[PDB]
């Protein structure tokens, strides 16, 4: 996240950190995700597409730091890895960029609630906040586009939803943005999601609940003027979500 503040998992208890094992000994961060129900985490297909080997990923819940442990964290293996079949990537956009991970611990259970592990709510069919709404994003992604390392402390920031009319202006993204995407930016193009933040949540208050309104998907550069962050529009994937969980 470019800008923002450092935070702790208690402020985003549904955030899930996904890593990949290289039996050579290292475990590297891949993407973020969100806990939907005890056994299901939702993220973005583009984080897995290149290596759909579920057995090589590890998912942690209740984590405030990237490579050190947090007291209360839970470790899970990926029992099922569901990618969208109509996922497609083009020069910038990722289409149908949503994925589901069914988790299981070594004891054979799913997540349990704690002050650091909670689920986030899903929107009602095709129901979104109106543009102008401030939503927050969280993640362990880059703090500057030129960095080649990820921060060790979790970060969060606030961005506002913008209209499709504004985002589809030729000098923003044109027709690369579809009705199945949402754009969110900082009025002053100072804070934004960036590389490493994919798969994580765009949370807004909708009908009185903190709802998973979007999943970090793509963007040109990070915090660039007229280049908003683009998110998968969760409200338009509810049937898909329901069919598999």
């Amino acid at each position: 996240i470019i800008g923002g503040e450092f935070t702790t998992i208690e402020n985003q208890p549904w955030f899930a950190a996904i890593y990949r094992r290289h039996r050579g000994g290292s475990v590297t961060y891949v993407c973020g995700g969100s806990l939907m129900s005890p056994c299901w985490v939702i993220s973005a297909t583009h984080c897995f597409i290149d290596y759909p080997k579920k057995e090589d990923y590890i998912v942690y819940l209740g984590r405030s730091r990237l490579n050190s442990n947090t007291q209360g964290e839970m470790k899970f293996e990926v029992e099922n890895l569901i990618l969208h079949k109509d996922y497609s990537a083009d020069t910038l956009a990722h289409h149908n960029d949503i994925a589901l991970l069914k988790i299981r611990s070594k004891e054979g259970r799913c997540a349990q609630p704690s002050r650091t592990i909670q689920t986030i709510c899903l929107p009602s069919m095709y129901n979104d906040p109106q543009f102008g709404t401030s939503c927050e994003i969280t993640g362990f992604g880059k703090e500057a586009s030129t960095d080649y390392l990820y921060p060790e402390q979790l970060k969060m920031t606030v961005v506002k939803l913008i209209s499709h009319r504004e985002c589809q202006q030729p000098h923003y993204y044109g027709s690369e943005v579809t009705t199945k995407m949402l754009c969110a930016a900082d009025p002053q193009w100072k804070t934004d999601s960036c590389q490493g933040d994919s798969g994580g949540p765009l949370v807004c208050s909708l009908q009185g609940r903190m709802t998973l309104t979007g999943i970090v998907s793509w963007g040109r550069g990070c915090a660039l003027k007229d280049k908003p962050g683009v998110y998968t529009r969760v409200s338009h994937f509810l049937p898909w979500i329901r069919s598999h969980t």
Partner: peptide, 13 residues
């Protein structure tokens, strides 16, 4: 009653 019921989506404690 079972742990799962304690989940309350969207609530920060």
């Amino acid at each position: 009653p079972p742990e799962e019921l304690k989940f309350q989506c969207g609530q920060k404690t």
